[PDB]
Design a protein around this ligand. Structure first.
Ligand SMILES: Nc1ncnc2c1ncn2[C@@H]1O[C@H](COP(=O)(O)OP(=O)(O)O)[C@@H](O)[C@H]1O
Ligand SMILES: Nc1ncnc2c1ncn2[C@@H]1O[C@H](COP(=O)(O)OP(=O)(O)O)[C@@H](O)[C@H]1O
Ligand SMILES: Nc1ncnc2c1ncn2[C@@H]1O[C@H](COP(=O)(O)OP(=O)(O)O)[C@@H](O)[C@H]1O
Lengths: 371, 52, 77, 371, 371
């Protein structure tokens, strides 16, 4: 037989067998339900909808979002999603493979315990594992040491990994991910005051986040150009309906990462967090990390982040020593890709959970057995 | 309304904005207040360098 | 005083920013005898004289109501 | 000289010098024009009409409504209104005073820029300011911290203010105000099916909103009483013409605030919005706000809102901690009153805009200079 | 005249005249500043805040913490604090008394030199002294020999003192103090995953550290009880808001002192450090110290430390010889109390620095003249 991996890194959800280059297909983890009396009697009433099916159907559906802050909000909804994904895309039965789970690090045990409990009981599945993002990120990026930044749909990360080991004290974990940024966007957008608030309306922004964003090289200087020029300003359509045209409101958005005033918090930002977390970690290693600096997924997609990051580190580093960052093309997929690699090696046969343990001891097994 | 509202709102709300935001002045001040590594490490390097 | 539910100390502080640097002839009073606290020190044709605070601000406050005399105008007297 | 404040909080419009207890008089901001060939040749034709003059004249006039959703729709109309108000009520010349402007928060810059541009150019006026509602609401209510709900003629608000500072991220802003509710009313009213739609006909409802409304204590229980009793039902005249008598249709109306299905939207309502916006804001402050809870203006006029609100918070709060709300008598005037206080303090002499700046820099000045 | 002593042992800050039993009042040495646009114009803007005033005001303020690792971070801030303390609590003028300063031992000269420089220049003060914690600890505890453990807000200490003399080689100095432990606490706390990170949120933990902690008697056995029982688990409120209920997460915390893996370092811990530092010191004295063993301040407050410490020493000692430890009630105050004693004796009149020397020679004077 053969081995199968779910990505539940948030945003669209990624699933695929070991050794395929890329997951078969991918789904937002939107969940949505009707909003109005069902008045075509000819229609079959289905009360819950998910995935691109919903993405089409959206308008009378209204959304629930089953993961806040990387924490999965409502289990039975997940179970709906999960069941759908297996049967509809995968045409797969729980017995068929070991299955591998993808976790925010340093987050409450409950997600571990219920996830495993459900999936061994509700699904019945040969072998289970839950793995921390950064490990995959290294394996895919193939440098045994490193530090990773990956700010997905969900909670945003700093982990230094040294070769072959964790520094769990070192690690920083942040709820700054693009969704909340986007919801700040609206509080921007009312300046131009084309204005709409609901969940689907919020996801419409996601497209603009694809298309229209780019990273500020320098904030002051950008403001000076903002006074000078309109090339900074670009014209974009409603997905249907109007043309819309957007100024500094594009570039201002990512700066939140550097300055989370605009929705206001203190953690001194991605880069200062990173250098902080470095200065926690010990002295000699540091050069390697100055060399090996790695980024991935949802926010990183933006053009230019790595450059201003390097500018920031050149601010904070003693300039004397080499600095560079890695910005691979495939970052948003990176995790599941690494998961595939993770699946490949026979050592997990030593390492998987088996049904037997789940019989003989509880969810408690995990927290010893896995990281 | 399609004449009455739209004649103004399409025409003028086209061009909405320019400023060096005072709120961004707030952001700048806050970030200055909360660049811990800048203030603390500059001060410590400055003092600690002098050893007599 | 229309700023409510707050304390003369607040204004003390506003003095200390506002005048106490700026306004030459007014002064933080020195220590002197006879008194628990004195707060203002300034210079006058009579000479130079120094004075003190109890929270009294509201005492100068003037409420009004039409109604009170409004109805008294009805009254017999 | 002396200092003068316009309220342009929507609904009737409120204007008065600093230190008067209440504005001299107040006007709806209706605008209206002829509908029919003018056939008394003896009549002078005036093509636009405003204020109680129109309120009398209405029938052949037809209305335009120059503020949607708190956003002022058509500038030159405003200018008509504004000019009229000064000269006819106020007997005032633009030079005469500083003037203070009253704004929905978090709404498009354009209202700022054109408002100032016009009023410095078209009127020529010593000093200008635009101020956010909640600030006034606190000053009048005199508790330096707080949260305010004021749902006027126009867009409906949540702002927590802490003492001396803004939390602009915290803030929620909603187009749920009584006008749109009233227009829903007609879609109710056709059940009894005495039915009329035009603008003046819509304003006729406003009287009923004065007289006939009261707040549902409990919705289910009210329905049970609705089955039991007719004391719930009251008898009311046309302003002229018929007696009309109205059932649950009265109390059902305010529930929209709690459930904006009936004209259907999702934002989970006043109270759930409020507690949401709290749970955004940080942990320690919260008790104060549980203590200090403040409401004003158009919707709040209804008897009973505060009670069911408290019921709702007792649902959502941990019961352990004190809760109360403030419901002052004067709420509908509150804003302009607070504005008077705002006018009083000399610090605005430090703070006003002056003509000089408007000379030396554009409308752009405001957005730095004011909130 | 009369003589006055500042405690700048970190945490709340302690100040009082010679011969009073306890300092007049005490302040955290928090410093904090605004975070948000100041939007009550009525408010006076003060840009920096300290002490219980801030402790009330906190929410929009954000904290800076002017002492890391017992090293005082930013001088001018200190000067603010110091000035405030004199005038507001003490109603004292710098001329009024000799003043006595309280120092982490074995730490960089700079704190000496600037502290003295400022306080003789910025304040002008008859006589100055800086004294090492352990000396006071002995004087208060009144045993001329000893070893002290006092792990305050700040860097954590071992000093053997023999009667009348120092063994500066003997001494061990550690950055393990409760603050950093507390920040580890959060990385615990996300297991239950009620989770908040900012400075004030971090200080909220301090209360729990007061209330909820107690010392592990035996770690394995405690885990066995953890499997058995919930009496280990207690229920506690938010300072306002929720009830929170906490398991082993309480007792696990102090073990860090015994095992600084959990935030990971090597120094083999309090007790093994102590016995190490003993085995450095010479052979005959040792029995006395086995008898005379003394502990104080922030961490020691926990019930039970002395017991497991004794268990540890009975592990490491040859059991043959007497062992005991002292655990006075008043330990957290102990230092300033001892300082009062230190102030009392006329010999410091021989010993104080005077302004004259500061005139005739630099800060350099101290490092000869004081320890
Ligand atoms: N074309 C794009 N450009 C920029 N950001 C995008 C794009 N497509 C998706 N994103 C963002 O990337 C994230 C996709 O989820 P993901 O990065 O997988 O999160 P997680 O790390 O939780 O798995 C979301 O924040 C989504 O809005
Ligand atoms: N007697 C009344 N009872 C209930 N509501 C009223 C009454 N009079 C006016 N209103 C409503 O109060 C609002 C008046 O406008 P206002 O509250 O000043 O709005 P804004 O907050 O935009 O200034 C309108 O929605 C109006 O219909
Ligand atoms: N009730 C309490 N229980 C346990 N620890 C406490 C309590 N109150 C304060 N502390 C801790 O004790 C320390 C107080 O500072 P202190 O011991 O004076 O440090 P220093 O030795 O630097 O003077 C801090 O670590 C504080 O968190």
């Amino acid at each position: 037989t053969t081995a199968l991996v779910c990505d539940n890194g948030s945003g669209l959800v990624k699933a695929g067998f070991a050794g395929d280059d890329a997951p078969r297909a991918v789904f937002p983890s939107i969940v949505g339900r009707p909003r109005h009396q069902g008045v075509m009697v000819g229609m079959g009433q289905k009360d819950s909808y998910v995935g691109d099916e919903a993405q089409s159907k959206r308008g009378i559906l209204t959304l629930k979002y089953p993961i806040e802050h990387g924490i999965i909000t409502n289990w039975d909804d997940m179970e709906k999603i999960w069941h759908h994904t297996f049967y509809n895309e995968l045409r797969v039965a729980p017995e068929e493979h070991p299955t591998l789970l993808t976790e925010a690090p340093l987050n409450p045990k409950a997600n571990r315990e219920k996830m495993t409990q459900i999936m061994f009981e509700t699904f019945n599945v040969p072998a289970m594992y839950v793995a921390i993002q950064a490990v995959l990120s290294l394996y895919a990026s193939g440098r045994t040491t490193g530090i990773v930044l990956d700010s997905g749909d969900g909670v945003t990360h700093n982990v230094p990994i040294y070769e072959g080991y964790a520094l769990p004290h070192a690690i920083m974990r942040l709820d700054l991910a693009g969704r909340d940024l986007t919801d700040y966007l609206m509080k921007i957008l009312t300046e131009r005051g084309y204005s709409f608030v609901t969940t689907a309306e919020r996801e419409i922004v996601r497209d603009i986040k694809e298309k229209l964003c780019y990273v500020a090289l320098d904030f002051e200087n950008e403001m000076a150009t903002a006074a000078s020029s309109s090339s900074l300003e670009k014209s974009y359509e409603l997905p249907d309906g109007q043309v819309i045209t957007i100024g500094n409101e594009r570039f201002r958005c990512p700066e939140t990462l550097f300055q989370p005033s605009f929705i206001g918090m203190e953690s001194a930002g991605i880069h200062e967090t990173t250098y902080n977390s470095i200065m926690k970690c010990d002295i000699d290693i540091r050069k390697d990390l100055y060399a090996n600096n790695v980024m991935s997924g949802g926010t990183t997609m933006y053009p230019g982040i790595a450059d201003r990051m390097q500018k920031e580190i050149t601010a904070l580093a003693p300039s004397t020593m080499k600095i560079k960052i890695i910005a691979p093309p495939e970052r948003k997929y990176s995790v599941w890709i690494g998961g595939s690699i993770l699946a490949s090696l026979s050592t997990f046969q030593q390492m998987w959970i088996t049904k037997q343990e789940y019989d003989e001891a509880g969810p408690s097994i995990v927290h010893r057995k896995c990281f | 309304x399609x004449x009455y509202x739209x004649x103004x709102x399409x025409x003028x709300x086209x061009x909405x904005x320019x400023x060096x935001x005072x709120x961004x002045x707030x952001x700048x001040x806050x970030x200055x207040x909360x660049x811990x590594x800048x203030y603390x490490x500059x001060x410590x390097x400055x003092x600690x360098x002098x050893x007599x | 005083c229309m700023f409510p539910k707050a304390t003369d100390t607040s204004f003390k502080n506003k003095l200390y920013e506002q005048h106490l640097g700026k306004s030459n002839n007014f002064q933080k009073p020195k220590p002197a005898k006879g008194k628990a606290e004195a707060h203002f020190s300034l210079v006058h044709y009579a000479g130079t004289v120094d004075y003190n605070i109890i929270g009294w601000l509201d005492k100068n406050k003037d409420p009004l109501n039409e109604t009170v005399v409004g109805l008294y105008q009805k009254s017999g007297l």
